[PDB]
Amino acid sequence: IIGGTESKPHSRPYMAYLEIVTSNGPSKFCGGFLIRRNFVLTAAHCAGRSITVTLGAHNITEEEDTWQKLEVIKQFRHPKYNTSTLHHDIMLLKLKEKASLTLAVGTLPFPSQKNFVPPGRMCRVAGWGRTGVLKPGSDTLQEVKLRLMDPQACSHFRDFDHNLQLCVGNPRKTKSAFKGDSGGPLLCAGVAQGIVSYGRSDAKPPAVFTRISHYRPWINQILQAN
Ligand SMILES: COCCn1c(C(=O)O)c(Cc2cccc3ccccc23)c2ccccc21
Numbered sequence: 001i002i003g004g005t006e007s008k009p010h011s012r013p014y015m016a017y018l019e020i021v022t023s024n025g026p027s028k029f030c031g032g033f034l035i036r037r038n039f040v041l042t043a044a045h046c047a048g049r050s051i052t053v054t055l056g057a058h059n060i061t062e063e064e065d066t067w068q069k070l071e072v073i074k075q076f077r078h079p080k081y082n083t084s085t086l087h088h089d090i091m092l093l094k095l096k097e098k099a100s101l102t103l104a105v106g107t108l109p110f111p112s113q114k115n116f117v118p119p120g121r122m123c124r125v126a127g128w129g130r131t132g133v134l135k136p137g138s139d140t141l142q143e144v145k146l147r148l149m150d151p152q153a154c155s156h157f158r159d160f161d162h163n164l165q166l167c168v169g170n171p172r173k174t175k176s177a178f179k180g181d182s183g184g185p186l187l188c189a190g191v192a193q194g195i196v197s198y199g200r201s202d203a204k205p206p207a208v209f210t211r212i213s214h215y216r217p218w219i220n221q222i223l224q225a226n
């Protein structure tokens with residue numbers, strides 16, 4: 001998160017810190033969010049050979065009783081996820097066991113309504129991602145309030161599509177999700193509407209988020225079947 005504030009500890013109890021293993025490089029990290037006691041939603045580009053989820057974290061360097069380190073038993077990457085266009089950048093993670101509900105750990109279920117969110121409003125995104133182009137990932141959960149932009153603001157992302165994705169962050173500000181915030185939720189009035197997907201290497205906003213409303217059928221399909 002660039003240009004944000006430190007989250008009040010445990011104030012976003014659905015946040016998941018993902019450590020992603022690949023066969024041919026060191027660990028990579030993403031965010032995500034707990035939508036059922038045994039399911040975390042995140043970005044498809046966060047897939048790997050195996051994933052661990054840490055729930056209940058604030059400072060991810062300091063173990064505490066709120067932590068739940070949970071094994072992922074299966075990754076459900078969107079079947080149409082495209083590494084060229086980056087369309088359909090969404091994935092569900094099934095946890096081996098259901099998480100414990102605590103003050104620090106809880107689900108964020110979707111409301112019944114899946115209305116298309118138009119441009120104009122402010123939403124908030126949280127993550128442990130980098131705090132600048134040349135800055136490592138934050139030890140502490142950070143968050144930032146960003147403007148939903150009209151889709152034309154994201155035209156320079158030539159594979160952006162307004163139906164599929166939200167355009168997030170006023171270009172006049174530095175405030176932005178960034179690398180390592182991948183897979184984290186964008187909440188608009190307390191409701192998850194986006195998932196951090198991608199942006200510019202130089203961190204100039206806006207960035208592109210998966211538009212959750214579009215994937216609500218797929219999400220439901222996976223959850224009901226598993
Ligand atoms: C998990 O990393 C694999 C490589 N990778 C990364 C990454 O962090 O390098 C991202 C995320 C990303 C990259 C560039 C700029 C961004 C600005 C805002 C938010 C996210 C951004 C990403 C997206 C799709 C596919 C592969 C990707």
Ligand SMILES: [Zn+2]
Nearest residue numbers: 009058064066
């Ligand atoms: Zn704590």
